[PDB]
A paper describes a structure:
Human endonuclease VIII-like 1 (hNEIL1) is a bifunctional DNA glycosylase of the Fpg/Nei family, which catalyzes the removal of damaged bases and subsequent incision of the newly generated abasic sites. Unlike traditional enzymes which are commonly referred to as highly specific biocatalysts, one special feature for hNEIL1 is its unique capability to recognize a wide range of substrates, including formamidopyrimidines, hydantoin lesions, oxidized, and dihydro-modified pyrimidine bases, derived from all four canonical bases. Here, by integrating structural, computational, and biochemical investigations, we show that hNEIL1 uses a triage mechanism to achieve broad specificity and reduce futile repair of normal bases. This mechanism involves two mutually competing interaction states: an activated state that commits catalysis and BER, and a quarantine state that temporarily separates and prevents the flipped base from catalysis via auto-inhibition.
While we also crystallized the complex structures for more lesions in this study, we were unable to obtain intact substrates in the active site of hNEIL1, presumably due to the residual glycosylase activity. Hence, we introduced an extra E3Q mutation to the truncated hNEIL1(C∆95 P2G) (see the “Methods” section) and succeeded in the determination of complex structures containing 5-hydroxyuracil (5-OHU), spiroiminodihydantoin 1 (Sp1), (S)-guanidinohydentoin (Gh), dihydrothymine (DHT) and dihydrouracil (DHU), respectively. Despite the very different chemical structures of these substrates, they are recognized similarly by hNEIL1. The damaged bases are fully extruded from the DNA helix and inserted into a relatively loose binding pocket, which allows the accommodation of substrates with varying sizes and shapes. One edge of the flipped base points towards the protein and forms close contact with the side chain of K242. Noteworthy, across all these structures, we observed an unusually short distance (~3.0 Å) between an outwards heterocyclic nitrogen atom of the nucleobases and the terminal nitrogen atom of residue 242. Based on the similar overall conformation and detailed atomic interactions, we conclude that such a tautomerization-dependent mechanism may be a general strategy for hNEIL1 to recognize not only Tg but also 5-OHU, Sp1, Gh, DHT, and DHU. Oxidized substrates of hNEIL1 are often bulky and contain non-planar structures; this disrupted aromaticity is expected to diminish the π–π stacking with Tyr244 and hence destabilize the quarantine state. Moreover, it is expected that the bases with less solvent interactions (e.g. DHU) would favor the formation of a stable quarantine state compared with the hydrophilic bases (Sp1, 5-OHU, Gh, and Tg).
Residue numbers in the entry: 2 to 202, 222 to 244, 250 to 290
The structure:
Amino acid sequence: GQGPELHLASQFVNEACRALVFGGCVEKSSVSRNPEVPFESSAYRISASARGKELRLILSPLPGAQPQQEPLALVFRFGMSGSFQLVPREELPRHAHLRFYTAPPGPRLALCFVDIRRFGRWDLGGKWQPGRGPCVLQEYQQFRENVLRNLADKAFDRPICEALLDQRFFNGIGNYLRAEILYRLKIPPFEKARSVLEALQNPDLLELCHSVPKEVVQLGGKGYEEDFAAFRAWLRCYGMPGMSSLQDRHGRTIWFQGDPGPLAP
DNA sequence: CGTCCAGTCTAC
DNA sequence: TAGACCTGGACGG
């Protein structure tokens, strides 16, 4: 996921787990090379929040939960294939690498971090990855100033479609989003980042870095395969017939119309 | 069958 | 940076 997927997952966790109570340990799959989660509680609630391409779960024990314990936070990055699912306890998906189990009475469910390709990671702190800029979805004003007040940075030397994946500055922006955003303004992908942003020191590029991911979040769907049909209709550029497409210098495909721009490999 | 396609993260 | 890290779906002999 990119920002909208992390945001929708955080919403899913909060809605699904709102009236659930978990107990037991946090079971990690043998196959997963991420950390064991050292947390056991007779009774705990799960909640989520998102910031850019990161999701923080908090495990919060109830009054009286044994053993006595402070709440524990985990931060996930999803990679290419990461998702949350709430399934029956006996019918865990293939590639569920982290499971939290409901306590009884009522049906015995499992909240699972499911990650086919195992690119997703998690950490025992609750701290956002330092270096990551403000969330384009929830911290717009901070994200926007953080760009304009650092155009001198060597990252803005690169073409605009490469800078747009720099998570120090576009925390939440992924491959489909850079395609869709530039297509709305018809900005050539291999225009020089500093030149495109100096030109605004009309929704502009930084406004669309907020508003376009927001359009995806308001669509809902995406696991939270039917409300993928809507999303695939929503795309105007990325992967769409009669669209130009090159590799950026890190070998990532950028979709666009017409003029590729001055720095085009 | 077979090949190619879909965000970090860390060590050269 | 450039390569590694993984699985499954899509498309082609």
